[model samples]
Target: GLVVSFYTPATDGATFTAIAQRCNQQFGGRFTIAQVSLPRSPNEQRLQLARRLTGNDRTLDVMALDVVWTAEFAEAGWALPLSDDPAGLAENDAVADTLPGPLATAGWNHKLYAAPVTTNTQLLWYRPDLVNSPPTDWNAMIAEAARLHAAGEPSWIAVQANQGEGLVVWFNTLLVSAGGSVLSEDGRHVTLTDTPAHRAATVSALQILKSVATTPGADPSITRTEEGSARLAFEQGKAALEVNWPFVFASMLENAVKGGVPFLPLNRIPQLAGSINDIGTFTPSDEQFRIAYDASQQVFGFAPYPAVAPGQPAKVTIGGLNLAVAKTTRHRAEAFEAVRCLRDQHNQRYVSLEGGLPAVRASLYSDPQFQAKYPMHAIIRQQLTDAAVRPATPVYQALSIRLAAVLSPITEIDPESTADELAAQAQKAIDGMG
Candidate 1:
């Protein structure tokens, strides 16, 4: 009954098409759902759409918005409001459960902006057979990397330490793993000031860089670091581990066959199960404490981001997207319906089969067929439970900009003035806050 447009225009476009085909098959095409493809920068797309809408164009009943663009679309009042329709507002658990952290992101000032279409999260990938022992602690990981390097078989870990989004991944992983949070408990003030956990984790990240765990050339910066190059490094048997998203698995699997390369090994191995020798200068009591500490985080060991606690233990951070009804869409009611339709057990199964994430609904999670289709659904579901949300305020974008300005040096910006310059610049950014 509605036509939706997407930017990527691939999997989701196919999904919209599949939904339409099924609807037409079952309901005889009573209403048509189509996709319009136009490629441009987001702000550019916004300008084009504004012109068409303000001029009273009859085309494009619904728009699939980027999560970050919600504010722009909502403020412009281009889409219709679902509040105008009541019976269509019924609750749908399938859609509701699929959302956790993203629900807050898609909404602004008490109104829903856009519903999440799909979701993704980061995970650690390794050659199970080769990593005879997974490193339990940061020290163990570093030592293993060194040993691997010494043996002429380096264990290259794919962390995004470069400037931009990749840098955020690099820093935030350490921030969370080191038990540092963005704001205080009340969420009013910055809390990272002079935090021991923050320093320890940051220093640990530096140590990784210094120790060749994160080499100079492999910064994971998209501008400077290419995943294909990174993938090539991994597949050529140059690196033992990589941390990336699910799409890489499918992409590499396909590439492996087509390119005459072996398929990437993607089996679940025990958390930090690798054997390490020559751990010295520690009393038996201290060693026991270290083992116990790692065991506590075993459930979260394979998780993407681990936040360290000063006296406690490490915690994991969560990531993904959620869908909300666009307040500006002319077809808010229908858009909501589409989202609700996706909440159905049938649609969740489709999402699981295609995207490889667990269905948000508890009902679908228990279904044997769905589980069989995605055995890793439980793993993802567990991650959602353990994951912590990142800084989500509008200023976060600015904060990231400033953080990079200060932190970029850690990745090889002028060695002459980096540390002191970083501290001065970072302090200025922090102090500049209103």
Candidate 2:
């Protein structure tokens, strides 16, 4: 008998632990899985994993990795390839029907090093009351907000600019949406070079960032706003538009009931959906459930993240976890097999019912139950198919630090100078080899 330890962030209550327990039972005593809880936050989880993997910890068999950690883990030889064949990770489908966005994040050097698990992406959330036609691009969005502000309406734009990964995700989304990347395909060189196209895109992206932060409609705390605060501003009616995640739908539904707001065009008010945070946990009585769903559908609207270029598609940054096998695992083959079982359709669907968006392409898209639970599934699916991923590199953390530093005080960023600084900083970070 073997007991393999599974490492993942233990946030979100007993979800991870319960999953591990069920997985252990499925093994039928031939092998056992011991859940090892990590920190709640991605950065803290990475730091702890780094320290343990650095020490060549064999006890860490299967670990849940933040999507951006792929290159870093693979480059450090911390995660094992899914197969033994040449370019194994690519040659093997670590998990069935993996979505492109998450599948891309699960690989490094064109090889699959991890099994795609759950995924998440942001949407452009707005108050339909303010703008009949939401802006499709950042420039237009800024212009619209400015116009609204000049007209003395609720016109602020909610965004994330806090000095953390949230800020980096914003920059990455903009860079990719503008048709550029922070690093080249091989992750060995900076992409913001002397090329005209790169220059145009970089400048355009930074200029938009600058404009967004400097506009009269800028959120008063734009410089330090993060995920929660950005959402707060919009729900509180201080901002006309918000760029955030699907969680907004859940929050708004909960808020609607509390404030006695009618989500539906009903003659009377609807009852509360209880204390549910997200629709996944929304198991109220049928009537109450209908009201909550109606609230989300009526009180707010969502679209793909604002594009960097007019008439061009916007590529939102992908967020999710992937299951990777540890390089120093005590049970090698069994660890890989366990990963397969852990991310199977049943589990992915289960997680989707618990606040995560499934990475199993099409698994829950057309299901009536799934749609009822996630009213915003259509946009999420459409955007995820072509989502942008962070630059894959072992020195991703260090590079992101430099990128964040240059992007701060968003109001004062000069596109060209910022691009140059980013390129230099990126090269140095990669050159140092983490």
Candidate 3:
């Protein structure tokens, strides 16, 4: 049997494993699907694939590409064009049903290069128990946190403030929501550097960063915070609000239950009546753990990402992976079929719940069980439907690294001066610094 290798970023144990099983069964005896685990980091995955593909690796049949890699893959002739191939994804119903952000991210030059497997966008997760009202904009959110602190409540606004992809994600959402962009839509030039209003465009975005790091609601060590740091802080009951991916919701629930559990088997030693990590000293009875997981559940609330202003919803930048058939594969037809099966709406929904990553399919947003598992499905679907894509240029890596370096710590960011600095560096980076 011909082997179809699938290089994928499988975050969990079962999601892609099941897909390969299903795909293998669907294909009968002609070929067996092989799952090749790869690093989830974009740069690492990109370089890994590039090294293999550079020599025209034939065994690399199907791969799960980061959404940002669609352009690079298509331009480098590494991905098979689904629309043009006899494998036939032209006008695919599944493609039509995909959420807009992932849909756009999977296409290049008006051709579909991959099938989007999942999608991600940030939303404002807050403790409703602490916040009496929702703040629709950044300024309002900052002020509300101050109000919480004035009464001596947990008032920190947890954000991914570290210098890396997390900071880039935060900044892009802010810039897009505020009606600015780092690059033009076509990716041929730097939009931020050319505009006379470059400073005007990014000032509001940088202002929020500066204010969040320096103001009343600011975390004392905000400059050191990343997504994991923010999630841990929020779950430990120190932060009132956070901007993060959907995974935090389930994480909070799981951690809350573990935090409230009264005992540990401790395996080999004497059975202890305390948590393994001892995140907190308080523990609920068996009844409290069973009747409800409300220790953290009751207070956890979600809303649309705060707007840059008061009028419209923020245009969040979507992040996710897509399924692309490798051009060098002899098993092109089987690989394409495998991709289709891999992204089948049914499997995607399962992956959605299994991984806490949002499904790319629009229909699942209303599935009864899915809604039960992901109460925030409505916000995710709506945001992805209108969500802004990260700059799709092939030079995005260089551009993002430069921008992130310039914007590190965020507290020291001077919007007026930093905007011009961003422009200068973006232009220099785009000039092929790498």
Candidate 4:
């Protein structure tokens, strides 16, 4: 009785397809959901959605919005408020049940514009077998990296400091961990500069860049293939650690196996020497086993991103996707039903199996099925709870745009230049946003 069209990228089609198949199997033939594949580029995705909206004169009914475009889409009348339904499906059946990260993606103003679907967060994955113990802080990460590099091993770490969205995500997490941000509490001033928090984060990021990081054909705006190449180098055991999203977690085993490397435990990034920040920079290591102990001390471990500068509040931004009901949807009720169905607790299991970060619903996380599937769910759960939420600004798109343009130095600049510019640019960009 319901007709639904989905706009999805090719890379994620199979994953979504599985969800659709499972949904269909669970719900029978009550809903006819069609998948419309789109290229990975944002413009291509936009064009396809546009054609569906204007060209075919067909209602998208439901649309999966890119986080950065949420404001624009919401402002342009492409999406509708999801929480308009009052007292209809209250009591844990609403959009709030979705994963917090994904929910954050769709959030705008006081109203929820969409239901969060696919959720992901960046994390540090590594080979724990080789480490003397475990790494628990950035300094230890740097030390481990240096140790790996000194032994004639290929590289110590791979970071998305390259350029583009990867760099933006990387830096955002880094800035948060490093203890800096773009705006003040009032959201009126850019405290990135002349702020101790910003300066500390700058120093922290620069420290990592200076300690152990390689750069080749490394433009922050490098193509996905380029970024993949860097990660592949690590998968090939040419690197010791790589910072990336959960989308690649399952892929790590295969990539490592293909590259003749072995998989190891993925732990959160470590806390700094003194501060208690919760920022996360997930860089997976290349060692067959990344952990190393000095015979007495444990190796490395994950720490929350640092607290804002010295005394500033600790903050972490969430990055993920959300589902929106298109403004043109003639069947708002039906679309709402589909959204509700997707967020159903029973259906949430499919999400975890598909390798997605669990949404806001904590119950879905503790479900035995999830625990059996993901051994690391417990740790990840902790990370999520302590993770920061990025700024919820309407101009996030423009901010990301300008950041990509200038933050290329993260990976592109020479080591000396990087050391000098990395912090400067980070501060500049943070200030640029507000």
TM-score of each: 0.67, 0.85, 0.86, 0.73
lDDT score for residue 104 of model 2: 82
Flag regions of model 1 displaced more than 4 Å. 6-28, 35-114, 160-162, 184-188, 194-236, 257-260, 263-314, 413-434
Candidate 1's displacement at residue 402, Å, is: 3.6
Please report, in order, the local distance difference test score of every candidate based on alpha carbons.
0.47, 0.74, 0.76, 0.54
Clashing pairs in 3: none
Off by over 4 Å in 3: 10-14, 84-86, 90-94, 196-198, 220-228, 260-296
lDDT of 2 by residue, 1-434 (tens): 88878888875335566566678878898897777888866778899998889888878888888898988899888887777423343225564566777888888777788887678898898777668877899888988898899989877888745667777888888888888888888877788755888877788778888888888866767555344467677767778788876766655654555563333332234345244545335335556767656555555788878888778779898888888888878777778767766776666655665434444546677777777766678888888889888888888888887887778768778888888887888878889843
Residue 319 displacement (Å), model 1: 2.7
Ranking by TM-score: 3, 2, 4, 1
Query: How many Å off is the CA of 197 in candidate 3?
Result: 4.1
- Between candidates 1 and 3, name the one with more favorable lDDT: 3
Scored by lDDT, model 2 comes in at: 0.74
Tens-digit lDDT string for candidate 1 (370-423): 665444556565555555455544444445567666555454543224334444
Error of 4 at 18 (Å): 1.4
Cα displacement (Å) at residue 51, model 3: 2.3
lDDT for model 1, please.
Answer: 0.47
lDDT of 3 by residue, 13-39 (tens): 345776688778877898888888877
